[PDB]
Amino acid sequence: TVLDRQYKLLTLFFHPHEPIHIKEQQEIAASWDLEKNIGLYENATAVHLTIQMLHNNYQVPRGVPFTVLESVHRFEISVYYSLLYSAKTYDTFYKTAVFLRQHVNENLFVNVLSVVILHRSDTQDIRIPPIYDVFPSYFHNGEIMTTAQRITTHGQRMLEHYPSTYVWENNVVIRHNETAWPYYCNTESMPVSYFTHDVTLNALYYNIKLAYPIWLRSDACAIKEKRGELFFFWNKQLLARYYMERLSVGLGEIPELGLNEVEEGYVSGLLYHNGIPYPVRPNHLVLNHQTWHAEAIEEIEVYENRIRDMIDQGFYITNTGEHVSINSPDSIDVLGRLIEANVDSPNVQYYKDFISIWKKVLGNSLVHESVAFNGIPLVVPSVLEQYQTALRDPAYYMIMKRVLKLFNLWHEHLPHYTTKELSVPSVKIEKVEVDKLLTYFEYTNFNVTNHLHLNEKSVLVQRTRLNHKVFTVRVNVKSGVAKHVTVRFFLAPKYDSVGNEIPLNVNTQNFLLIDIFNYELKEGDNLITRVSSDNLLVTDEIDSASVLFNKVDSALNMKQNILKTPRHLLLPKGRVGGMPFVLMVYISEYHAPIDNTIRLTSDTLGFPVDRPLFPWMLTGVENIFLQDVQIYHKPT
Amino acid sequence: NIKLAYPIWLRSDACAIKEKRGELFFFWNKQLLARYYMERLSVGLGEIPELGLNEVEEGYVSGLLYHNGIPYPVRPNHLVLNHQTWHAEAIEEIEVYENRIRDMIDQGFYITNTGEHVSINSPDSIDVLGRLIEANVDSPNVQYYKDFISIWKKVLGNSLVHESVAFNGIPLVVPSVLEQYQTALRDPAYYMIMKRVLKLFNLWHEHLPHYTTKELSVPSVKIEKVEVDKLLTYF
Amino acid sequence: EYTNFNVTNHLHLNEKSVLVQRTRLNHKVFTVRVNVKSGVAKHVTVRFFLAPKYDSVGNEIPLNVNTQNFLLIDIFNYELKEGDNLITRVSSDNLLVTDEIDSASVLFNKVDSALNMKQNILKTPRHLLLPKGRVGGMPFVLMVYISEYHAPIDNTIRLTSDTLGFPVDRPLFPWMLTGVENIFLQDVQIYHKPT
Ligand SMILES: *[C@@H]1O[C@H](CO)[C@@H](O[C@@H]2O[C@H](CO)[C@@H](O[C@@H]3O[C@H](CO[C@H]4O[C@H](CO[C@H]5O[C@H](CO)[C@@H](O)[C@H](O)[C@@H]5O)[C@@H](O)[C@H](O[C@H]5O[C@H](CO)[C@@H](O)[C@H](O)[C@@H]5O)[C@@H]4O)[C@@H](O)[C@H](O[C@H]4O[C@H](CO)[C@@H](O)[C@H](O)[C@@H]4O[C@H]4O[C@H](CO)[C@@H](O)[C@H](O)[C@@H]4O[C@H]4O[C@H](CO)[C@@H](O)[C@H](O)[C@@H]4O)[C@@H]3O)[C@H](O)[C@H]2NC(C)=O)[C@H](O)[C@H]1NC(C)=O
Ligand SMILES: *[C@@H]1O[C@H](CO)[C@@H](O[C@@H]2O[C@H](CO)[C@@H](O[C@@H]3O[C@H](CO[C@H]4O[C@H](CO[C@H]5O[C@H](CO)[C@@H](O)[C@H](O)[C@@H]5O)[C@@H](O)[C@H](O[C@H]5O[C@H](CO)[C@@H](O)[C@H](O)[C@@H]5O)[C@@H]4O)[C@@H](O)[C@H](O[C@H]4O[C@H](CO)[C@@H](O)[C@H](O)[C@@H]4O[C@H]4O[C@H](CO)[C@@H](O)[C@H](O)[C@@H]4O[C@H]4O[C@H](CO)[C@@H](O)[C@H](O)[C@@H]4O)[C@@H]3O)[C@H](O)[C@H]2NC(C)=O)[C@H](O)[C@H]1NC(C)=O
Ligand SMILES: *[C@@H]1O[C@H](CO)[C@@H](O[C@@H]2O[C@H](CO)[C@@H](O)[C@H](O)[C@H]2NC(C)=O)[C@H](O)[C@H]1NC(C)=O
Ligand SMILES: *[C@@H]1O[C@H](CO)[C@@H](O[C@@H]2O[C@H](CO)[C@@H](O)[C@H](O)[C@H]2NC(C)=O)[C@H](O)[C@H]1NC(C)=O
Ligand SMILES: [Cu+2]
Ligand SMILES: [Cu+2]
Ligand SMILES: [Cu+2]
């Protein structure tokens, strides 16, 4: 019965903005009544709250932007999640989903239903469609969407007048985004536009926040996920990759964010479904004038000073006034939880969310204090207030760099690793060599037909993306005696924006983990010959909505999880003629430990680059090797 | 439609030469600004803000979209004009041109394209004064008296100049509301700029002799009483 | 490459020769060959200009803007025959750029022991003529312009009577270069040898 259930849940994601077209779903929406069917829900309080909200009309109006950073939106989405998750039977769950689809905003319903499907036992096999297919308007420029609407409604008669559009195959018409948006931010935004505007990266951020919502309290499974450590590690990896891209395109180090003025602005060029332009941050934005920006920055400074005091003093304050030490090396998780100010933080009243205030300030979304129903505020969020568009703005990377400065301060106070924790007896690496590192640009097609308001075709968008050829890394190692070992590869830049070789201690923060795997080392001489195509950290493209629908309706793979980095974004572009980089191979013992499942050997994720490392403490540690490589770009 | 009737790029003929282009410009701008000030007083917004050369407090968000779907440029609140931006150079050029206009007004004459002095002290020189201020194709000397109002519009439109060209030729531009006559009036900055130009015009008019009791009087005509029946407005 | 400079004249000798080693840019000899139809026989002047092709961001710079960025690298005379011709200019022959002047020690030796006219104090050094470029190639634009020969030691420089920056002193547009066939714009790549 998997196929039919998946088909129905897909039909729930066919046209969010438009109303229900399938008749029996209308019958269910008109027939079901929560009041009399309270007995089928475990959480009766959620049922009462939902009934009250739906009766008083105290809900976010339909056809309006939705943001989780607003309090009332969080309350509404949490209540709906509690109601949906408390469904005893799958039938009750589906019937509540239909009713909410009828009586709930599109974005909120999609998000809550996806979260419920991911975290429900009865729906551990259902596959949810990609976000960039349900709402294409968050990943393509407004001109593209308007042209799509025109070419569709024209009946493809004036389409042949358009030279940009073309018919690649029957029933599909494709455009070019190569020639468009001549007006753009420029500054530091254009050279890295092939990485920051990538659809897959924003989709990955959205899916990550689907797996770990800020408004959802962890269960036994989510309590072993080490939420804070994942936050820190993922932010570090993203910032290291972004810095590598900037060095590749010659833009320099990530600008440091102050408290007086921000020089770089952002113009999104995106449009909401209704047609409201996004807020724009001007260049040379002033933060020390008579504006709400000043008050927001003062609150941000207070909260960050509280975090700094907690880090330095070595303990945090409970909600009653007790001191809880965080000086042990295993307190990184609670530190991250406190910094994030999620619902799992011990004390959110004193440790508040300054990152959201940073996002509000640097989004320059004019607060007009407008409310509907004498209730829910009406907000026009900027790109930074949406996880599916935040990564397009450099300000996000600047803010995360500040948070990573806080994290580095905390890690600095920790004792440095010893020659016993960081050494494996009688394992010496001889030589490490990669076959080649080449990158090239290629074309890809995305389906944006779900935005078209069909009455009674399939428009696609062509985009340019980076990719790399398969590469093999071969290392020879002395093994001493037989062992079961783990090998980790790290990649870092070798020269900074000016030309001086970066010391290893500084590079410790710029090392990007690209592969980790097990091996059984024999006695004597060995050979590791890892191929990039075998790594499980990076995955291939997930099947599109159309492909999944075809494979389902016509009637598995475990190499496509929503919480993995796309393969084509693993390797930096480099330069034509070669760009130098540093590879680091580290071998350690194997210390023995589907929607949201990731686990490796029990140890800090960034080991051994989480703490600062110095050359003088690597003498006597032979199982770590630092080689130099060159990354090339194939021009086309 | 007004700019259709008197395009800046069209030279006047016998009919358009009797239209007194400059006087029409001055009169229409004065009427528009007086009506706008009356509206502001009616809605309790106060006097029209005076435009400086350092910072503009009031911004504008149009909410309009072009046919293709490109959003209009947005001017932020508290825009800074004395930083390391092209705004500073534009403002410097504007100041130079306005100082040239002020010197021409005060000295009582304007300079021809050859270097001759032509007096503008008579009361009938308002037309040529307006033509010079507008810097249209009918101005005697556009090379020395240049169009600072267009530079003001460019500066206060905050249209990011990206120096993009097609055909190795025609630049591609995304104009703001102030650069289009069909959308300029939506922005208060237009009224501020026109108030500055009207300050220049008032300076010129102040230098003129005041009317006498002979020019301003009609023999044996006395008004007794004036009364209107009612003045009501509705939406 | 490395070069040595003599700084002994600063030393306050009482009753040696210290030198300083410095790194400088240089280029290998290059030859430019152009084929031209000549019509009838003439005495002509050929000028070469070099400019960048892309700006700091990546957009191709329009010719009008590049008019201010054109660097004159060579100017010389020729006698064009009738029919097909061939110019084969070698960088080592240009008189605009000169070689290093003899140092004080070298000049003192050559004088006390007991001419050349390719060393004037008012000429650009040869090794600074060509931009460094990039490893892997950097695109640039060469412009060859041919005009008529309009007939015109310490401080002496004179060429055909005309504006020095002709024809790049005034702005130039593509649409006004139709009908002018004696001007050609080619693209080249400059490479840097890493060491
Ligand atoms: C079915 O559906 C419903 C609706 O969908 C779901 O209901 C939600 O359920 C969750 C979980 O139960 C609730 O969250 C918790 O709520 C309680 C109660 O908060 C309410 O009352 C507060 C006022 O009383 C509190 O303060 C007074 C003094 O002023 C005090 O006398 C009283 O005893 C009590 O402490 C309100 O303040 C509060 O909201 C107000 O304040 C909020 C904060 O400023 C503000 O945001 C609101 O807008 C409003 O202004 C609310 O009305 C909370 O006590 C509890 O708080 C814990 O977690 C937060 C972080 O989320 C943390 O900051 C707190 O310090 C506290 O942390 C303790 O518990 C954590 C786990 O919950 C734990 O991880 C911490 O370590 C800590 O516990 C450990 O340490 C502490 C000492 O630090 C120790 O005491 C403990 O024993 C332990 O050792 C949560 O916020 C939602 O409120 C509720 N929402 C609704 C709409 O119903 C329901 O979950 C669903 N059920 C099922 C089965 O699915
Ligand atoms: C058919 O179709 C064609 C195409 O559609 C139409 O052609 C247009 O026709 C109009 C009208 O004839 C032209 O406008 C006039 O052009 C002339 C010539 O300008 C050209 O040449 C200039 C260079 O030569 C000038 O300067 C040098 C020194 O450097 C000097 O030696 C030489 O004698 C001459 O003075 C160029 O500079 C100019 O363009 C360049 O400069 C422009 C300004 O910076 C710049 O914008 C351009 O981009 C370019 O850089 C051009 O190539 C102009 O002389 C004439 O200028 C008058 O008007 C302007 C204001 O518009 C004013 O500033 C000048 O001072 C001058 O004003 C005198 O004439 C006015 C009337 O024209 C008069 O109102 C003024 O009072 C003044 O006349 C009186 O006072 C002066 C002393 O101040 C006195 O000398 C007089 O005798 C008199 O007493 C116009 O700009 C268009 O150029 C032309 N366009 C094209 C594409 O062909 C044609 O009209 C159509 N025909 C029909 C029948 O329909
Ligand atoms: C893009 O996605 C739409 C669905 O949003 C696809 O629509 C399908 O088109 C085929 C054409 O043969 C139909 O048989 C299916 O029934 C359609 N499905 C739906 C849900 O309408 C469209 O084919 C996709 N196009 C591409 C190129 O992937
Ligand atoms: C650097 O310059 C000094 C002159 O300032 C040179 O000094 C000469 O050294 C030779 C050595 O055999 C003497 O014979 C000359 O009499 C010196 N001349 C003077 C004026 O003192 C010195 O040789 C130069 N060194 C180099 C390497 O060029
Ligand atoms: Cu959409
Ligand atoms: Cu500034
Ligand atoms: Cu201000």
Which among A372, A286, A312 is positioned nearest to A60, based on CA atoms? A372
Q: Which residues pair with A478 in a beta bridge?
A: A428, A525
Structure tokens at B69: 């779907």
Instruction: Name the residue type at position B48.
Output: I
Smallest CA–CA distance from B164 into chain C, residue: C59
SS3 content of chain B, % helix, strand, coil (to 5): 40, 5, 50
Half-sphere exposure of A109 (CA within 13 A, CB side): 27
Q: Which chain C residues contact residue A578 at CB under 8 A?
A: 135-136
Cβ distance of C174 and B164 shorter than 8 Å: no
Show Cβ contacts of residue B92 under 8 Å, excluding neighbours closer than 6 positions. Answer: none
CA distance C179 to chain B (A): 18
Nominal resolution (angstroms): 2.8
Which among C126, C107, C128, C127 is positioned nearest to C116, based on CA atoms? C107
Largest CA distance in chain B: 72
**b/e sequence A66-85, b meaning 16+ C-beta within 10 Å:** bbbbbeebbebbbbbbbbbb
Asked if residues A282 and B76 have their Cβ atoms less than 8 Å apart, the reply is yes
Proximal ligand: closest to the CA of A282: 6
CA distance B216 to chain A (A): 51
Backbone angles phi and psi of A339, in degrees to 5: -65, -40
> Checking phi first, is residue B72 left (phi over 0); if not, alpha (psi -120 to 50) or beta?
beta
Burial (CB count <10 Å: 0-12, 13-18, 19+), residue A451: buried
Structure tokens at B76: 């932020």
Instruction: Name the residue type at position A94.
Output: Y
> Three-state SS string across C113-147, please?
HCCCCCCCCCCEEHHHCCCCCECCCEEEEEEEEEE
Proximal ligand: closest to the CA of A322: 1
Half-sphere exposure of A170 (CA within 13 A, CB side): 0
Which among A132, A268, A278, A269 is positioned nearest to A199, based on CA atoms? A132
Asked if residues C79 and C36 have their Cβ atoms less than 8 Å apart, the reply is no
Tell me how the structure was determined: cryo-EM
Q: How far apart are CA B76 and CA B80, in angstroms?
A: 9
Q: Which residues pair with C141 in a beta bridge?
A: C51, C187
Residue A394: count other Cβ atoms within 10 Å of its Cβ: 25
Q: Which residues pair with C134 in a beta bridge?
A: C191
Backbone angles phi and psi of A13, in degrees to 5: -120, 40
Atom of ligand 3 nearest to the CA of A550: 15
Q: Which residues pair with A582 in a beta bridge?
A: A492, A628
Alpha-carbon torsion, ordered A373, A374, A376, A379, to 10 deg? 100
Instruction: Tell me, yes or no, if C2 comes closer than 8 A to chain B by beta carbon.
Output: no
Q: How far apart are CA A289 and CA A297, in angstroms?
A: 11
SS3 content of chain C, % helix, strand, coil (to 5): 15, 35, 50
Q: How far apart are CA A226 and CA C5, in angstroms?
A: 64
Measure the CA angle with vertex A274, ends A271 and A276; round to 5°.
45
Specify the 3-state DSSP secondary structure of A137.
Answer: helix
Asked if residues A451 and A137 have their Cβ atoms less than 8 Å apart, the reply is yes
Q: How far apart are CA A178 and CA A446, in angstroms?
A: 14
Instruction: Tell me, yes or no, if A578 comes closer than 8 A to chain C by beta carbon.
Output: yes
- Contacts of B159-163 with C-beta under 8 Å, sequence gap 24+, read B159/B73, B160/A183, B160/A267, B160/B73, B161/B86, B162/A182, B162/A183, B162/A184, B162/A186, B163/C59, B163/C65
Asked if residues B116 and B129 have their Cβ atoms less than 8 Å apart, the reply is no
**DSSP 8-class letter at B178:** G
Asked if residues C48 and C147 have their Cβ atoms less than 8 Å apart, the reply is no
Q: Given the structure tokens 């150079």, which residue do they identify?
A: B89
Cβ distance of C57 and A191 shorter than 8 Å: yes
**Residue to probe by mutation, ligand 2, list B142, B144, B150, most atoms within 8 Å of CB:** B142
Asked if residues B95 and B152 have their Cβ atoms less than 8 Å apart, the reply is no
Specify the 3-state DSSP secondary structure of A630.
Answer: strand
Give the gyration radius of chain A's Cα atoms.
26
Q: How far apart are CA A488 and CA A480, in angstroms?
A: 19
Asked if residues B62 and B183 have their Cβ atoms less than 8 Å apart, the reply is yes
Show Cβ contacts of residue A619 under 8 Å, excluding neighbours closer than 6 positions. Answer: none
- In this structure, the residues whose C-beta lies within 6 A of any atom of ligand 4 are C 6, 8-9, 17, 19, 103-105, 108
Please name the helix (run of DSSP H) or strand (run of DSSP E) that holds residue A24, with its range, or none.
helix A23-31
Measure the CA angle with vertex B54, ends B51 and B57; round to 5°.
60
Atom of ligand 3 nearest to the CA of A14: 20
Residue B52: count other Cβ atoms within 10 Å of its Cβ: 13
Q: How far apart are CA A194 and CA A229, in angstroms?
A: 29
Half-sphere exposure of B17 (CA within 13 A, CB side): 5
Question: Distances in Å between the alpha carbon of C128 and those of B92, C23, C25, C118, C195?
Answer: 37, 13, 7, 16, 18
Please name the helix (run of DSSP H) or strand (run of DSSP E) that holds residue C97, with its range, or none.
strand C97-98
Q: Is A460 touching ligand 3 by the criterion CB < 6 Å?
A: yes
Structure tokens at A566: 């796309």
Smallest CA–CA distance from B170 into chain C, residue: C62
CA–centroid distance, A458 to ligand 3, in Å, is 7
Beta strands in A410-510 (DSSP E): 428-434, 438-447, 459-468, 472-478, 483-493
Instruction: Name the residue type at position A310.
Output: M
Where do breaks (C to N over 2.5 Å) occur in chain A, by preceding residue number?
456, 555, 593
Residue B150: count other Cβ atoms within 10 Å of its Cβ: 14
Q: Given the structure tokens 């589906």, which residue do they identify?
A: A94
**DSSP 8-class letter at B60:** B
Residue A171: count other Cβ atoms within 10 Å of its Cβ: 7
Cβ distance of C63 and B168 shorter than 8 Å: yes
Smallest CA–CA distance from B61 into chain A, residue: A279
> Checking phi first, is residue A208 left (phi over 0); if not, alpha (psi -120 to 50) or beta?
alpha
Q: How far apart are CA A184 and CA A190, in angstroms?
A: 8
Would you give the distance in Å from CA C163 to the centre of its chain?
18
Q: Is A10 touching ligand 3 by the criterion CB < 6 Å?
A: no
Asked if residues B88 and A161 have their Cβ atoms less than 8 Å apart, the reply is no
| Strands across the sheet containing C183-190 | C71-80, C42-52, C138-148, C183-190
Asked if residues A503 and A511 have their Cβ atoms less than 8 Å apart, the reply is no
Q: Which residues pair with A493 in a beta bridge?
A: A581
Alpha-carbon torsion, ordered B191, B197, B199, B201, to 10 deg? -130
**b/e sequence B10-31, b meaning 16+ C-beta within 10 Å:** eeeeeeeeeebbbbebbeebee
Which among C39, C71, C83, C63 is positioned nearest to C182, based on CA atoms? C39
Which among A113, A86, A99, A94 is positioned nearest to A31, based on CA atoms? A99
Q: How far apart are CA A572 and CA A582, in angstroms?
A: 12
Instruction: Name the residue type at position A93.
Output: F
Q: Which residues pair with C98 in a beta bridge?
A: C125
Structure tokens at A351: 């440790």
Backbone angles phi and psi of B95, in degrees to 5: -65, -40
Q: Given the structure tokens 């097909």, which residue do they identify?
A: C84
Residue C16: count other Cβ atoms within 10 Å of its Cβ: 5
Would you give the distance in Å from CA C99 to the centre of its chain?
12
Specify the 3-state DSSP secondary structure of A121.
Answer: helix
Please name the helix (run of DSSP H) or strand (run of DSSP E) that holds residue C3, with its range, or none.
strand C2-6
Q: How far apart are CA B82 and CA B54, in angstroms?
A: 6
Instruction: Name the residue type at position C121.
Output: I
Which among A537, A536, A521 is positioned nearest to A475, based on CA atoms? A521
Which among A380, A390, A67 is positioned nearest to A205, based on CA atoms? A390
Which among A6, A5, A65, A18 is positioned nearest to A376, based on CA atoms? A65
Q: How far apart are CA B42 and CA A573, in angstroms?
A: 62
Would you give the distance in Å from CA A493 to the centre of its chain?
23
Which among A360, A359, A338 is positioned nearest to A348, based on CA atoms? A338
Proximal ligand: closest to the CA of A283: 6
- Which A residues 65-124 touch B at CB under 8 Å? none
Structure tokens at A217: 């309290």
Which among A238, A245, A243 is positioned nearest to A204, based on CA atoms? A238
Helices (H), C49-133: 63-66, 104-113
Helices (H), B2-121: 2-5, 14-17, 21-42, 86-107
Q: Which chain C residues contact residue B167 at CB under 8 A?
A: 174
Specify the 3-state DSSP secondary structure of C92.
Answer: helix
Residue A50: count other Cβ atoms within 10 Å of its Cβ: 25
Q: How far apart are CA A582 and CA C184, in angstroms?
A: 45
| Strands across the sheet containing A472-478 | A428-434, A472-478, A528-531
Q: How far apart are CA A636 and CA A634, in angstroms?
A: 7
Specify the 3-state DSSP secondary structure of A484.
Answer: strand
Which among A421, A275, A407, A240 is positioned nearest to A339, based on CA atoms? A407
Q: Which chain A residues contact residue C57 at CB under 8 A?
A: 186, 190-191
**DSSP 8-class letter at C67:** G
Residue A106: count other Cβ atoms within 10 Å of its Cβ: 19
Specify the 3-state DSSP secondary structure of C69.
Answer: helix
Smallest CA–CA distance from A185 into chain C, residue: C57
Cβ distance of C59 and B163 shorter than 8 Å: yes
Instruction: Name the residue type at position C139.
Output: P
Instruction: Name the residue type at position C170.
Output: R
Asked if residues C90 and C29 have their Cβ atoms less than 8 Å apart, the reply is yes
Structure tokens at A571: 């390797």
Q: How far apart are CA A86 and CA A94, in angstroms?
A: 12
Asked if residues A18 and A12 have their Cβ atoms less than 8 Å apart, the reply is no
Specify the 3-state DSSP secondary structure of C168.
Answer: coil
Q: How far apart are CA A434 and CA A491, in angstroms?
A: 12
Which among A142, A72, A76, A140 is positioned nearest to A111, based on CA atoms? A76
Measure the CA angle with vertex A223, ends A217 and A228; round to 5°.
85
Structure tokens at B10: 């069209």
Residue-by-residue DSSP string for A342-394: -TTSS-TTTS--HHHHHHHHHHT------BSTTSSB-----GGGSTTTGGGSH
Measure the CA angle with vertex A61, ends A60 and A66; round to 5°.
55
Structure tokens at B231: 């003045």
Structure tokens at A161: 């007048």
Residues making up chain C, counted from first to last? 195
Asked if residues A482 and A520 have their Cβ atoms less than 8 Å apart, the reply is yes
Q: Is A164 touching ligand 3 by the criterion CB < 6 Å?
A: no
Burial (CB count <10 Å: 0-12, 13-18, 19+), residue B214: exposed
Instruction: Name the residue type at position B210.
Output: H
Which among A367, A368, A382 is positioned nearest to A268, based on CA atoms? A382
**b/e sequence C50-65, b meaning 16+ C-beta within 10 Å:** bbbeeeeeeeebbbee
Residue B177: count other Cβ atoms within 10 Å of its Cβ: 24
Alpha-carbon torsion, ordered A349, A354, A355, A359, to 10 deg? 120
Asked if residues A385 and A393 have their Cβ atoms less than 8 Å apart, the reply is no
Q: Which chain A residues contact residue B70 at CB under 8 A?
A: 142-143, 183, 269
> Checking phi first, is residue A429 left (phi over 0); if not, alpha (psi -120 to 50) or beta?
beta
**DSSP 8-class letter at C174:** G
Residue C182: count other Cβ atoms within 10 Å of its Cβ: 13
Q: Given the structure tokens 């438009």, which residue do they identify?
A: A18
Structure tokens at A315: 């303990």
Residue B171: count other Cβ atoms within 10 Å of its Cβ: 11
Q: Given the structure tokens 């390797």, which residue do they identify?
A: A571
Alpha-carbon torsion, ordered A236, A242, A244, A249, to 10 deg? -170
